[PDB]
Symmetry: D2
């Protein structure tokens, strides 16, 4: 007794690259109407692209307006980490503004339409493993924020969940010392890195009709690492 599929208006922030790209392509093949944000390079073929820096509340507003006009109001928001990568105030605030406050900005802009239409799915994608304290603070902060949103908006059938990837095969992970790669594996029960498609599949589920009674959850996609 599987709920019938509904084609949703989807916005995937940072959806032209890496894990964000895998997510956007998967949601498109699922049957959804998928738009992505980017910082200039553009969306790949078959996806509607809008340029926006998530540190800029006006650019966020214009992005959502453009998507609304293209494919209808955003029903499923996938917020990917704006940045991924001793410590200092500038580096701390830069990461917080992009990854935590940036997540707030897109969630806030999505919320009114989601509440009004009594449907919404906010799905926040944590930054990858693995600048320690700034990324740690922003990722944990997004989880606290998502829980607050879930507590406020779940009564309107608007949920907010977090996908927490562990070590995933990306360009930066492959650039890491051969020595760091094989020994990150010592912390991972699965004894292998995850793939972008493995993250995308979990997002596919959270966007689907099957995830309606999940709200305020953090689903780790990490081969057991974070236990």
């Amino acid at each position: 007794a599987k709920p019938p599929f509904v084609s949703r208006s989807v916005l995937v922030t940072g959806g032209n690259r890496g894990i964000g790209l895998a997510i956007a392509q998967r949601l498109a093949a699922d049957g959804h109407k998928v738009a992505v944000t980017h910082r200039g390079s553009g969306a790949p073929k078959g996806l509607f692209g809008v340029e926006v820096d998530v540190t800029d509340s006006d650019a966020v507003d214009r992005a959502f307006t453009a998507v609304e006009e293209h494919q209808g109001p955003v029903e499923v928001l996938v917020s990917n980490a704006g940045l991924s990568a001793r410590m200092t105030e500038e580096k701390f605030e830069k990461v917080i503004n992009a990854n935590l406050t940036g997540a707030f900005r897109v969630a806030q802009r999505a919320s009114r339409s989601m509440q009004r239409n009594k449907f919404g799915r906010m799905i926040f994608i944590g930054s990858v493993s693995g600048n320690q304290a700034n990324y740690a603070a922003s990722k944990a902060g997004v989880i606290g924020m998502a829980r607050s949103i879930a507590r406020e908006l779940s009564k309107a059938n608007v949920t907010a969940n977090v996908v927490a990837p562990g070590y995933i095969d990306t360009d930066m992970t492959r650039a890491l010392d051969e020595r760091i790669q094989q020994g990150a594996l010592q912390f991972i029960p699965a004894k292998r890195v995850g793939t972008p498609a493995e993250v995308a599949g979990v997002v596919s589920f959270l966007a689907s009709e099957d995830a309606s009674y999940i709200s305020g959850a953090v689903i780790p996609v990490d081969g057991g690492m974070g236990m």
Copy 2:
């Protein structure tokens, strides 16, 4: 890309009523080969059934053998609570059915999963007593131990933790109770090819309740 579907040999314990029944029916509609255990009331129409008291290790063993003969070795094990829902007797009865029972079915499933380098163990928490709380938290610790040991063999162990399901609302952000189908959909996902890199997780299906 979305990974190709694989029809799995599935066993759902307590798969004849309530949430277990919803899970069994959903996994069958997904395309899996679904067997259930039950305590006497019989299996649902269409599905292979075996009578098991999960406090009985011998009965668990002969159930798995019967299922292997019918549809092949169990690849996906869904362990539903033996009891729903303080004396030493009541405490021990719930621990034996809900915690040790989970161990019995997990242990019996484990050899074949490890050998074939594929397994999904999915434990379903009871709906919501020191006894029930201990057994539910206990199963989570057990699952995490199994995930730590066996994830390297592509054998994962995850928990679905339902809140209030209809088979009080002030404490639930959704302002409604969940349905058995809403639990079943999460189990469908965890049984699927899309859940391969999830292990040792507890997924709450509670409308935000236990956040």
Copy 3:
């Protein structure tokens, strides 16, 4: 919109080998409840099986009853050729198994389908003899008669006409033989909720051969 999936009670005759087996396995992975008939070699692992000689009307009747008891009344009937693949004896043997056999299973299925206002009869033509040609064309005429009478009750009858399937290429535009999975996919569609307004059709699955 795409109509919601419904898990149907399916019977596939000759569903234990070749194209029939591929059909049965595909329909089971689709989410249906799949039973097969066979002539002695047994059913595939996982699926409910009944021994039927389709020249025997009594054996057909007791097969349908056994299937009804197991998984509910047959909603989707897939009739595969009794024989694969000139004397009066050889002619009559092929007609009796392939044409009259199709009638026997169709007739037995028809009452319940009409009563419940749902039925899909799907006849699978033999792969490619005056006897075989007569029986294959005969089944098409029979199916068309059934479709004319019963489509008003949401009971349709369609034919899949395979060409050369691997269980010569110069006469095939595709320049290759078809696979059993390629036949099974067409049967999956005809069993689905998307085939509701198709009735009395013959769908060739032949890479262009019989065009």
Copy 4:
């Protein structure tokens, strides 16, 4: 053992209205990248639109080029009837040019890329029931053409099939005399009209990986009418 889904670049001619719209929406929800042609009014939200009159070979060429640039070369072509609706030469040639020659033009423009990439699905949608001789000639002509294409191109994994709808619920069918509506039913074993979604489901199948060994076929979607 179902073939894994592949997201195809789809062009549905006349895909902004009626049966064509139902087809385009279904193929989009299936997971494909769907573009439609129209004659000016535009594509609905979530579908890429291009304007083209299928009597104009240059406009067809430009349409396919625009789709190619948007979503990749056309892999699945759904050619819907340009026109639907005593007899005279002008009315005969008008319908032949739109419905038969128009089908040729789009098939021809699709063919080279399909052959080169060793994949293609041409799906021709016959005009609805039910100007007699011109529509009859064009619909039968499209079937002969499709069979020729199937004979030539099936060796390159390029197939050509026809969906032949009977009486389907559309704006024009509903405009027909109450008396003609209920008595068209006397010719239909199903004893009801079909829906646009019933046609779209058959097109979904013909576009899918399950239809690979079907070529040169005419699938009637008519509740048994045309037996």
